Design an enzyme around this catalytic site. Structure first.
Site, PDB file in Angstrom:
ATOM      1  N   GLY A   1       3.343   6.810   8.744  1.00  0.00           N
ATOM      2  CA  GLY A   1       4.490   6.757   8.023  1.00  0.00           C
ATOM      3  C   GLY A   1       5.532   5.811   8.458  1.00  0.00           C
TER       4      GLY A   1
ATOM      5  N   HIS B   1       0.623  -1.340  -0.035  1.00  0.00           N
ATOM      6  CA  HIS B   1       0.006  -0.165   0.018  1.00  0.00           C
ATOM      7  C   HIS B   1       0.719   1.181  -0.023  1.00  0.00           C
ATOM      8  CE1 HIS B   1       0.484   0.134   4.700  1.00  0.00           C
ATOM      9  NE2 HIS B   1       0.546   1.371   4.371  1.00  0.00           N
TER      10      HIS B   1
ATOM     11  N   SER C   1       4.742   2.390   8.425  1.00  0.00           N
ATOM     12  CA  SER C   1       4.518   1.098   7.652  1.00  0.00           C
ATOM     13  C   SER C   1       5.662   0.625   6.885  1.00  0.00           C
ATOM     14  CB  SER C   1       3.228   1.144   6.636  1.00  0.00           C
ATOM     15  OG  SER C   1       2.147   1.544   7.361  1.00  0.00           O
TER      16      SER C   1
ATOM     17  N   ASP D   1       0.112  -7.436   1.375  1.00  0.00           N
ATOM     18  CA  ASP D   1       0.395  -6.135   1.774  1.00  0.00           C
ATOM     19  C   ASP D   1       2.023  -5.974   1.764  1.00  0.00           C
ATOM     20  OD1 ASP D   1       0.382  -3.178   1.480  1.00  0.00           O
ATOM     21  OD2 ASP D   1      -0.527  -3.097   3.541  1.00  0.00           O
TER      22      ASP D   1
END
Ligand code: ZN
Length: 201
Positions: free
Chosen positions: A157, A77, A159, A101
Site C-alpha cells: 500500500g 495499477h 505505491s 503505471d
C-alpha cells in the site's frame, strides 16, 4: 435490462496524509470507512487537504498519492482511470499512462508540492504509507535497494508514495517492490524526470 442496472466505479478518495511538516513523520487519518465509501460514490469531498503525500483509497485498495509541481501523482495499477473526489465533485485525471503505471490529477487546493530533484544523488529515502522513512540506495534509472530488507507486508500500500533526495526533493514515485522469499530487497520507482516529461508533452 443490464444497461439500466450498470454500476459506476467510485472516485479515489483522500483518507489521510503523511505528515512531513516537522521533525517527526507520522500518518494521519482524515476519513473513516463509512465516510470514505460515501465520498467515493458522490465524488464530493469537502475536507481540507494538506501536505505533500496523501493516503488514498478505492473500494478495493488503499495506497498513496504524491504532489509534485502542482500535480497529484499515483500509480495506474491502484487508481486506474478513476476520478478523484474534490470539493467541487469528481475530478478527471490530468495524466493517464498505463505504460508508465502513472496517473495524475491537478493537485488539490491546500496541498503542497515537492520539487523535482536536480542533484543527481543516489542516497534516497522512501516514505511508506505508515510514515516509515526507509533509506534506499539508487541502483539504476528506476530501481533502488533497501539498505535493510523487510517483509513485503511492510511496503503493502505504499505505491504512489515518494522517494526523496537528501535535500527533500522528489526523485521518483514508488511503483512496486522486488521480492525474493517474500522479502523485499529492492524497489522499482517511476523517476521524476519521467513525470517532468509527461507534464510537458
Ligand atoms: Zn535533490
Amino acid at each position: 435490462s443490464h444497461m439500466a442496472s450498470m454500476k459506476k466505479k467510485g472516485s479515489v478518495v483522500i483518507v489521510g496524509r503523511i505528515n512531513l511538516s516537522g521533525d517527526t513523520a507520522y500518518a494521519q487519518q482524515t476519513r473513516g470507512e463509512e465516510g470514505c465509501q460515501e465520498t467515493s460514490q458522490t465524488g464530493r469531498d469537502k475536507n481540507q487537504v494538506e501536505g505533500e503525500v496523501q493516503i488514498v483509497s478505492t473500494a478495493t485498495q488503499t495506497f498513496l498519492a504524491t504532489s509534485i509541481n502542482g500535480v497529484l501523482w499515483t500509480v495506474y495499477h491502484g487508481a486506474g482511470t478513476r476520478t478523484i473526489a474534490s470539493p467541487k465533485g469528481p475530478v478527471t485525471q490530468m495524466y493517464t499512462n498505463v505504460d508508465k503505471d502513472l496517473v495524475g490529477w491537478q493537485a488539490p487546493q491546500g496541498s503542497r508540492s515537492l520539487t523535482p530533484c536536480t542533484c543527481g544523488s543516489s542516497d534516497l529515502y522512501l516514505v511508506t504509507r505508515h510514515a516509515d522513512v526507509i533509506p534506499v540506495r539508487r541502483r539504476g534509472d528506476s530501481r533502488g535497494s533497501l539498505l535493510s530488507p523487510r517483509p513485503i507486508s511492510y511496503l503493502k500500500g505504499s505505491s504512489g508514495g515518494p522517494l526523496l533526495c537528501p535535500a527533500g526533493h522528489a526523485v521518483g514515485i514508488f511503483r512496486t517492490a522486488v521480492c525474493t522469499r517474500g522479502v523485499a530487497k529492492a524497489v522499482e520507482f517511476i523517476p521524476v524526470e519521467s513525470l517532468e516529461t509527461t507534464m510537458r508533452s
